Amino acid sequence: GAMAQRMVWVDLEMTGLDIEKDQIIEMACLITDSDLNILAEGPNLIIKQTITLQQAEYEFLSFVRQQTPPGLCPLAGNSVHEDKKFLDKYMPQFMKHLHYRIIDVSTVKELCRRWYPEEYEFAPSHRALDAISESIKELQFYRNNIFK
Amino acid sequence: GAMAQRMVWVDLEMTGLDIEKDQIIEMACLITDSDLNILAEGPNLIIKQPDELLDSMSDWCKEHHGKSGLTKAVKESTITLQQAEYEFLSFVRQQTPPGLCPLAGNSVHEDKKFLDKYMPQFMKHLHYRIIDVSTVKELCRRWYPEEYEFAPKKAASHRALDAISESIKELQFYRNNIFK
Numbered sequence: 650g651a652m653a654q655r656m657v658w659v660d661l662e663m664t665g666l667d668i669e670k671d672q673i674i675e676m677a678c679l680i681t682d683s684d685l686n687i688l689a690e691g692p693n694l695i696i697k698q699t700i701t702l703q704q705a706e707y708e709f710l711s712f713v714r715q716q717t718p719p720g721l722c723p724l725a726g727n728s729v730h731e732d733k734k735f736l737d738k739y740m741p742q743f744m745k746h747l748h749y750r751i752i753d754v755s756t757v758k759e760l761c762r763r764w765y766p767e768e769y770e771f772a773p774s775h776r777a778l779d780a781i782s783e784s785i786k787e788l789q790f791y792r793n794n795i796f797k
Numbered sequence: 798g799a800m801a802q803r804m805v806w807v808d809l810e811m812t813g814l815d816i817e818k819d820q821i822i823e824m825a826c827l828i829t830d831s832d833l834n835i836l837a838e839g840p841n842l843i844i845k846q847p848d849e850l851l852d853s854m855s856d857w858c859k860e861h862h863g864k865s866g867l868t869k870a871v872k873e874s875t876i877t878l879q880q881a882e883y884e885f886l887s888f889v890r891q892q893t894p895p896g897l898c899p900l901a902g903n904s905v906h907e908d909k910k911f912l913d914k915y916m917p918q919f920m921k922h923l924h925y926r927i928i929d930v931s932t933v934k935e936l937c938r939r940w941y942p943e944e945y946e947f948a949p950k951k952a953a954s955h956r957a958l959d960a961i962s963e964s965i966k967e968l969q970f971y972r973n974n975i976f977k
């Protein structure tokens with residue numbers, strides 16, 4: 650039903666894209682329903698190299714366990730495939746609660762750019778939680794402007 | 798811009814989902830233009846991997862790769878990982894400008910994880926962004942539930958060339974039915 654169709658939105662800041670050497674500096678999480686209405690805001694945590702990585706994972710896993718059913722909801726965000734790679738490595742217990750699929754807003758952007766170039770031209774951060782809010786607005790924009 | 802807007806479609810088959818242990822056993826590549834028109838079929842290679850890895854695979858993996866004829870084809874293969882990478886890199890260098898075209902497929906972020914580790918030069922030819930058809934699937938399921946039921950079921954066994962053609966058919970189905 651509607652519960653399985655929720656989305657687990659995240660935004661992460663890393664030192665870089667090298668999975669073997671770079672680390673997660675910042676992370677935020679929030680839950681939307683299938684229509685992108687924000688149901689609950691999770692924490693915005695700055696991770697050490699403020700809190701430790703293992704405690705941030707407990708904070709985020711507790712937050713999604715009380716908002717989504719296990720293994721059903723996908724990770725959502727801007728270029729969230731980059732975020733998933735670091736979360737599979739550094740937060741594997743948090744990832745055990747989610748589906749393997751993602752709702753990558755930048756995939757939608759790559760399709761908008763190609764198929765609706767006029768709409769792409771007029772398509773619309775101090776915290777990672779603010780970046781999530783911006784990515785939801787970008788996705789809502791594609792829903793209204795390029796989807797049927 | 799038209800050449801930079803082409804898409805590099807890939808499907809991989811591996812010995813499991815553990816990036817620390819598992820290896821690539823099959824790869825296929827296909828090129829479409831911006832509008833999902835078929836441009837060129839690339840190589841379709843079965844990569845030689847050890848018998849220890851194959852015998853120690855998951856029960857899902859041993860059965861599906863056994864039944865499809867992939868485990869047998871891997872054991873008889875003379876293509877190494879390095880040889881397959883060279884063939885795929887050569888093919889995409891002939892089809893797309895460097896560092897501008899995205900990797901495309903179903904949950905292709907998982908294929909990207911294996912390619913970033915085992916075929917880094919092939920990934921360096923592609924842009925940072927991906928085109929994940931399973932993002933569009935998940936949005937179709939939610940926002941266009943009627944159209945979602947008309948999407949064809951994936952009929953292919955886990956063979957790279959057939960799976961990748963089905964991903965193109967799926968994204969073409971969404972372009973045709975849920976886009977404006």
Ligand SMILES: [Mg+2]
Nearest residue numbers: 808809903960
């Ligand atoms: Mg696949």
Ligand SMILES: [Zn+2]
Nearest residue numbers: 954955956960
């Ligand atoms: Zn497959």
